[PDB]
Amino acid sequence: PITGLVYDQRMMLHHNMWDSHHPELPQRISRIFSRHEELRLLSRCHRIPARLATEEELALCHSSKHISIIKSSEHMKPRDLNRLGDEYNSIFISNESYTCALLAAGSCFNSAQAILTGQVRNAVAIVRPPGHHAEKDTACGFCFFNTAALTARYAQSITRESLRVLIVDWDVHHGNGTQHIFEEDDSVLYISLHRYEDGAFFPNSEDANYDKVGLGKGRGYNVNIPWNGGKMGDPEYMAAFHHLVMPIAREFAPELVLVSAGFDAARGDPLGGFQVTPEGYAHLTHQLMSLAAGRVLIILEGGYNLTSISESMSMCTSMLLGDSPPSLDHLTPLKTSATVSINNVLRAHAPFWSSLR
Numbered sequence: 048p049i050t051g052l053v054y055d056q057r058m059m060l061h062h063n064m065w066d067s068h069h070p071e072l073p074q075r076i077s078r079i080f081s082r083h084e085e086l087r088l089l090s091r092c093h094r095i096p097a098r099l100a101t102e103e104e105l106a107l108c109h110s111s112k113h114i115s116i117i118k119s120s121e122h123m124k125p126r127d128l129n130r131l132g133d134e135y136n137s138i139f140i141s142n143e144s145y146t147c148a149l150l151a152a153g154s155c156f157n158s159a160q161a162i163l164t165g166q167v168r169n170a171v172a173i174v175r176p177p178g179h180h181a182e183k184d185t186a187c188g189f190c191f192f193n194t195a196a197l198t199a200r201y202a203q204s205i206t207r208e209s210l211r212v213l214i215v216d217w218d219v220h221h222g223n224g225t226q227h228i229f230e231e232d233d234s235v236l237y238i239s240l241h242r243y244e245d246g247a248f249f250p251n252s253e254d255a256n257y258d259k260v261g262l263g264k265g266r267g268y269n270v271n272i273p274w275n276g277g278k279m280g281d282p283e284y285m286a287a288f289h290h291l292v293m294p295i296a297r298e299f300a301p302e303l304v305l306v307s308a309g310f311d312a313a314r315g316d317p318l319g320g321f322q323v324t325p326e327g328y329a330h331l332t333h334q335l336m337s338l339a340a341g342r343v344l345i346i347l348e349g350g351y352n353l354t355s356i357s358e359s360m361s362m363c364t365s366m367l368l369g370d371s372p373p374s375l376d377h378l379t380p381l382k383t384s385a386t387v388s389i390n391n392v393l394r395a396h397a398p399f400w401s402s403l404r
């Protein structure tokens with residue numbers, strides 16, 4: 048089996064010109080890449096090139112107005128970019144932001160194509176800016192275009208429209224954009240684990256609660272696993288995978304798995320407040336590799352401790368390459384609020400997934 052890897056240093060050009068210490072740093076991707084080389088993982092992978100997404104590809108998920116506005120930012124002066132970014136929730140923009148967002152998406156299209164033709168078995172995409180908060184018609188939370196959602200639609204476009212795509216979103220934040228894009232879709236199963244705190248954690252919406260199961264033909268195809276009242280870690284994530292993610296995923300029987308792989312639930316993150324370990328992420332990756340005949344694409348989302356994200360994402364690639372999972376620590380009993388969350392999701396989704404009964 049061959050593992051693909053995409054990284055292009057041009058995606059570093061998107062930057063915050065007023066606050067050079069803003070956490071969504073250019074060096075997030077160069078640090079992950081460096082750790083892959085330092086652990087000798089890079090040379091074991093097959094390099095996949097980045098490319099620009101086209102505007103037609105962006106239109107698979109985004110409105111023409113939103114595409115045009117972000118495109119127009121390429122020609123603006125700093126004062127105007129500061130004002131434009133401030134129109135969104137948690138966005139900074141530089142003159143390279145649009146192109147970097149296009150490269151992030153195109154990188155993932157090339158990776159999905161390589162997976163779907165068998166050029167590689169699985170792949171990792173070391174990309175920024177992230178995607179999962181981006182909506183059809185707007186940017187949000189450091190995200191301009193929804194890379195994972197676009198990759199699902201691109202995959203369908205080169206195979207068949209009903210190709211079953213599973214998106215597992217383990218970034219500590221709810222992927223509101225991904226949920227909304229696919230909310231009425233039964234061809235793309237969206238499963239998110241996220242810190243929720245009864246709607247008080249970013250992005251601050253009850254859309255992230257366990258009772259949002261999808262709409263229309265998509266009822267049952269949106270699975271929110273929301274965490275409340277606890278510093279969750281490996282025990283809680285392993286339990287969620289055993290009781291919810293894996294049984295639902297196996298019943299769905301995806302033909303492609305995309306991971307919205309934020310590393311902001313990691314131990315050490317300055318924002319997530321959680322303690323998932325690098326070995327925990329390795330175990331989650333290894334479990335997902337049992338789906339879709341191994342056709343897994345891991346897409347970087349958030350994650351802001353450079354050391355944490357570099358170790359964590361490298362351990363995921365080690366798993367894609369076929370290495371044996373590192374040993375987890377002794378798993379403490381689940382925090383009681385985590386058991387409540389799991390039970391709530393189980394009861395909300397048992398009507399749709401007989402494997403949960």
Ligand SMILES: CCS(=O)(=O)N(Cc1ccc(C(=O)NO)cc1)Cc1cccnc1
Binds near residue numbers: 137188218309318
């Ligand atoms: C000073 C504002 S903020 O930086 O703290 N922030 C903006 C932000 C947006 C998206 C991501 C991310 O990773 N999405 O996947 C992270 C941060 C809000 C925030 C605060 C606490 C916990 N989370 C988020």
Ligand SMILES: [K+]
Binds near residue numbers: 232236261
């Ligand atoms: K869906």
Ligand SMILES: [Zn+2]
Binds near residue numbers: 218220309348350
């Ligand atoms: Zn996040």
